[PDB]
Symmetry: D2
Subunit: 115 residues, 4 copies
Amino acid sequence: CPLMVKVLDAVRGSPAINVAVHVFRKAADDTWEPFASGKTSESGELHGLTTEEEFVEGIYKVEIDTKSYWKALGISPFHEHAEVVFTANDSGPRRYTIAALLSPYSYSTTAVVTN
Amino acid sequence: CPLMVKVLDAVRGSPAINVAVHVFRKAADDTWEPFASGKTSESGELHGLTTEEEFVEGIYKVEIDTKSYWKALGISPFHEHAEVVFTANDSGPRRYTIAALLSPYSYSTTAVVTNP
Amino acid sequence: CPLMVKVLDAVRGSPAINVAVHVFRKAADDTWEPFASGKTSESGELHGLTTEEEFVEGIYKVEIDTKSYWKALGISPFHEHAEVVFTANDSGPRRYTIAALLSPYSYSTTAVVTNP
Amino acid sequence: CPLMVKVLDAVRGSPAINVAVHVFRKAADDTWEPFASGKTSESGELHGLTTEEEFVEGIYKVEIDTKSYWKALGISPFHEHAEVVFTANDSGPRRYTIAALLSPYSYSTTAVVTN
Ligand SMILES: O=C(O)CON=C1c2cc(Br)ccc2-c2ccc(Br)cc21
């Protein structure tokens, strides 16, 4: 599992559950091509997005659909979604974990890259 | 200004200076149209991107070119940019300050919204 | 000012207003002595805590009373405060801006340090 | 394991390894009494700090010794240490995870409280 996404709710101090996540890969014509997607689990995590074979070097975008998450909680948010855009590199460690910490008017995102 | 972008460097404890910022607005055909752009000042701030007249209701994307910033300091960072996508002025005109705090493998983006 | 504290609310996208801030300085006997205190303004900022004369080298603690802030908004938060502990002026006088961004179960604290 | 601490390095995109962590509990005379301590593992985590029996309601402080971490990396940091002060509550979920994301001149800390 070379790509995992983890989402936390900073308002409730809890995993952000049932958050839609869409991954895209940049195509040769500079458009974003759908690559993988899912919803975060009860632990705020999304695994099984891709395989080692398919996750080749390239530019990827992870969209986390934060607005719909906050709307479900009755909380008015700022962002439409959190975006994380990066180049996958074979030189570095083999596992990427994209973490996101969400508040209504702020988010932070961190990449933890390990072997 | 109705729209101001501020960028800070969490490694150096400084403003992030001369960072390129591109603003786009979503068109009726769902494409991202260019809206405004500039570079952060010595204070890490970018003012004068738009006017209250031109900054109508819509979905806007602020793209902060963080990779180029880090590379110039000798650092190879994780992200290509920091993106900030939001609906603006849907409840009438507001003033928006979009801040980003940058580290090589992490960033945070925050908005402060004030009613004139 | 050589020391400025800024506090923002990540739930509302606003300054955090009227937040109590206590500054302490570590004494020779390793105790925390009171140094300055105040409350954030309508802009979420607290200026005028100290002077360049009084703000000597030392270890300082800035305690931001976040629990009381959240409780007044009807929220029961996780943290009692946000604490910010740092050595100041060890390489000569510097200007320090300490910011805190608050959510009920999370906060971030950042420093921007500039040489006069 | 009712209390866990997890520390990440935002500069290197990696778990923050071998970081000293000291936990204190507030005594009746308002002093901080040493309660538990350890160093983060290769995964940036510290488990086994306390037990369900000993972790009673009260005010606790978790100090994360960030300055020594950065000094080891040759990076000049702002903070002496990251502090996290909170009241343990029996009404809520039974597990506290204190997470910290570290940069030289900034840190963020989040509590994830789950069952
Ligand atoms: O990283 C943190 O802990 C919070 O940082 N966010 C900041 C900030 C930090 C500092 Br230091 C100075 C000004 C601002 C600011 C000014 C405007 C807006 Br919007 C946000 C911020």
